[PDB]
Structures are given as structure tokens and as C-alpha cells.
Amino acid sequence: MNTVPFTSAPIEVTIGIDQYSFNVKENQPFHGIKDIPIGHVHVIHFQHADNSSMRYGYWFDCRMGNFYIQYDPKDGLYKMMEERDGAKFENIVHNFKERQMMVSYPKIDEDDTWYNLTEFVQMDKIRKIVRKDENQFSYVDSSMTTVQENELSDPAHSLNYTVINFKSREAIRPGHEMEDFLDKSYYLNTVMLQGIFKNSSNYFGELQFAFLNAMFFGNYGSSLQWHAMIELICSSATVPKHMLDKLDEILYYQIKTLPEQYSDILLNERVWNICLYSSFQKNSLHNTEKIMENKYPELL
């Protein structure tokens, strides 16, 4: 059980850890989060009480280092940092644990939600989408634009998602124009799976990471990425059977977890209706279609 301790809480803020969140008052004696499950990536995120603009946060894996959160009054935000002195960090964590100034990661034992949302998400892949190689953790916020968004302006602060574009030479073989545009199996299986991602796990990992950034930060480019990666599978007539079954589970848990009140901005009507009702895979996502019809029958 690992710990992300906090130096202090000088400004009022709503702090999230994965799908949980709590309110911290200005100068409240808050000193971090303990009992964080080992074996998954995690995200710790922030919304200041004064400026609900800019949600921001940090993707991390406690196996890769000892991390602490400290508020910077010059840059005006909570910053994640690495403590390279392990004795000093364990000692600071033990002090805080003894004074009971930490909240406990509040996981119900029956609950596999976070595992199901991050099954294929790897810290090493996150660090290639979010390039800042001198840190072992990755910063994301509501306003960061994606590489593909930049093409259509500071590249150091970009989300380097894999570019998917259905009307592109990468997607369309000369002489197979109609075939490749109406059935994207070539693009999915040869270009993306075999060529860029190498395997379906890496594809699903980027899909899941894009969704989580869309949900937790309202990052529009990430939502675009999530839908495009769904649509590419659903618009392919030939998909490995194990991928379709796994996709149905992935989407089920994403739709289950989405805040009911945010469905209007985060769910693209055209893509979901195409995917559930028109596409080749219209009959292959039974769990996702049942939860979508029972939870968001308006969108459909």
C-alpha cells in the first residue's frame, strides 16, 4: 500500500484520486493519500475552489518512485515531485500516518472499477503521449491540445496521441478507395495494430487513457481520440474475436462510470449511433449497448 504525501494544502481545492474526490479547505491540515493500490497507474487531480477553470493532474505509478504533492505559490498550482531520499520520504510518510493527517484511498473490496478502466494503461506508454522525460509522472490538464489538433500550438505541451484520419492516404490504399473507406479493416489491422501499436493491448491502453483524460479533465482532444479509436474498430468488418469481446467490456465500464450529467458533452451522438446500430460490429457490443440504452436512451 503506497502513499502520495502532501507538504500542505494552502488553497481550497477539490482533490481527486482516480474516481474518488474530496474537498480540502484553505490551510486545512491535509497531508496526502495513503493505501493506494499497487499494480495500477493512478491519477491525482485538482480543481481550485476559486477557478473551476483548469482541472489538472498527474498520472503516476508508485512502483516507479516516491512522489509528493507540494503547492507552488509562484506558479499557483499543486505540483507533483519525486523525493530521491527514500529514508526522508518514508520518515515524512510515517509522521503523517501517525498524526492521521492522510485520507485513505477508499476502495471497496468487491469493486473492480479502477482495474477495469486502466486494464491496458501502462505508465511507459503514457510518458510517450505526454512528453516530459525528466519526470516519472505525467501532467495533463483541460486545455492541452493534441498533435492532430495542432496540425489543423506549443508542441512541448501536446498530447501525442496516435493520429487517426479516415480520409488520409495512410487509411486508404490506392485502388482500394471504396473498399478501404467503407470497411476499415486494413487500416485497423495492418496499419494500426500490426504497424503502429504492435498489439491490441497497446491500442486499448491508448483508448482507455484518452477516455480517462476526457472524463477527468474535460480534455476535448482526448474525447475526439477516444471516439476515433472506437469508430475505427466498429467500422472494420474483420476484427479479432478477442478484441471485440474485450472492447465491449472496456466501453461498458467507461459508460458505467461517466457522470450522468456530463454525457451531453462527452458522448458523440454520431459515433455511438453508428457504432451500436449501423456498423459492422452493431451486434458485437451487447453489454455496452444495454447499458447505453438504459442509461442514455436520449442520445439514441
Binding site: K167, R169, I172, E177, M178, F181
Partner: protein, 237 residues
């Protein structure tokens, strides 16, 4: 962006552009089978690709053999249209290639955009105009070469005949669309109107009769009457 009433004059500037109409690509007759079911028989069609500034028409004849053993022919027809348009552009010298291609039906946008990926600088545009190019098969010489074809064939015409010797391309295009609009609303009447006097012969190398300026003015007026009338006969006014 879309082509409409408001940017109409762009059609006659010095930027090469083509209209593409696919209405007459996939043509069928519907009939009863001996069992009493219904079936279709394809007939020859054509792509109508027109430079509105010069009058140059690239009439690609679509032979029925191209549909043999194919499914979803109305969908295929749009992709075949885009394939042939792309091939036409690729066949032209660079300085003759269009800067824009305007499709008369929105369903052609994605097929043509995908076939033209090699030409990122050629803009593919829809239009808000309801142009009457479907009536091109009411022009006797065009209908004749389409129906006689025994294999795929491209035929080149100037749909303005020699009009640009005397009038501008704006005026020529307006005359063409009036004639075609009339033929589409009442083909019999429209065609009668061309032949009311029969001394005004069609030259062998032309599509329309050899009217004087003064006789065109009369013709054009009579086609506007026809269209109004049919609009009454149809809507009752």
C-alpha cells in the same frame, strides 16, 4: 465552402473548375418478371463533367458491363464516378487540372475527396444550387452517343457550341441552365420550342440550333413561359 447564389460569379473567373453531376451514371428500367416479381435492367449512363467557363464537357460514358456482378449499385455508382473524375484529372497536364471540383449532389463529396487524396490542393465543394444537369440526356446528340456505346468511352463536347464568340460565359451558362431547366420540367414542350421554325438547323458539330442573337432572345423568353406555366399546371396557379 458551398457554392450558392451569393458566390455565383466565381464560376466564371480564371480559376479552372469543373462541375460533376452523377445523376445519370446508374440508370435502370424497372420491369415485371414472368413470376410477377420486379427486376431492374441497367442501361448505359454517363458522368457529366463540365467546365462552366469554357463549355468543355467531358462526357464519360458508363457502359452496363461495369455493373456486372456488383452489389449495392447506387453506392458503387458514386465511387465509380469519383474514380473516373480522378482519372480524368490525372490525365490532364498540371496547368489544365482544376483548382476546384463542384459536385452537384452532396453524396459525392466523400467518394471524390477519397479518390483525390493525391491532389490536396484541389478543393472539393458542394453547392446549394438546384442545377438541372440531370436533363443532359434530353439533348439528343448526348443521349445518342451514350445509348450506342458498346464499351467504356469518353466523348468531348462544347455544350455552348460557338456561343462564346458572341456572349460571355456568365450569359452562356445562364442560357444552358435555362434550356436544361425547361427540358427537365416538360421535355416535349421544351423540344417543340426549339423546332417551332425548322430552317434554323443544328450544325453537325453542334448540340443546339444556330439561332441569331434575336432568335435566342425569343427562345429564351419562351422557355421562361414554359417553366412558369408548368409551375402553374403543377401547383395550380
Amino acid at each position: 465552402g458551398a457554392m450558392n447564389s451569393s458566390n455565383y460569379a466565381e464560376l466564371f473567373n480564371n480559376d479552372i473548375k469543373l462541375f460533376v453531376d452523377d445523376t445519370n451514371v446508374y440508370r435502370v428500367t424497372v420491369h415485371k418478371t414472368f413470376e410477377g416479381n420486379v427486376a431492374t435492367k441497367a442501361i448505359n449512363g454517363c458522368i457529366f463533367t463540365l467546365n462552366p467557363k469554357t463549355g468543355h464537357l467531358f462526357l464519360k460514358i458508363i457502359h452496363t458491363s461495369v455493373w456486372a456482378g456488383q452489389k449495392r449499385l447506387s453506392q458503387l455508382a458514386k465511387w465509380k464516378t469519383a474514380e473516373e473524375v480522378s482519372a480524368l484529372v490525372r490525365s490532364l497536364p498540371k496547368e489544365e487540372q482544376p483548382k476546384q471540383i463542384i459536385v452537384t449532389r452532396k453524396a459525392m463529396l466523400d467518394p471524390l475527396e477519397v479518390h483525390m487524396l493525391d491532389f490536396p490542393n484541389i478543393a472539393i465543394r458542394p453547392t446549394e444550387l438546384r442545377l438541372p444537369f440531370s436533363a443532359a440526356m434530353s439533348i439528343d446528340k448526348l443521349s445518342d452517343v451514350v445509348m450506342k456505346a458498346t464499351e467504356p468511352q469518353m466523348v468531348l463536347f462544347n455544350i455552348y457550341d460557338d456561343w462564346l464568340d458572341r456572349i460571355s460565359s456568365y450569359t452562356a451558362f445562364s442560357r444552358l441552365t435555362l434550356l436544361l431547366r425547361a427540358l427537365k420540367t416538360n421535355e416535349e414542350s421544351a423540344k417543340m420550342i426549339l423546332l417551332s421554325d425548322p430552317t434554323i438547323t443544328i450544325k453537325s458539330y453542334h448540340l443546339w440550333p444556330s439561332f441569331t442573337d434575336e432568335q435566342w432572345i425569343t427562345i429564351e423568353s419562351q422557355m421562361r413561359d414554359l417553366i412558369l406555366t408548368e409551375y402553374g399546371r403543377k401547383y395550380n396557379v
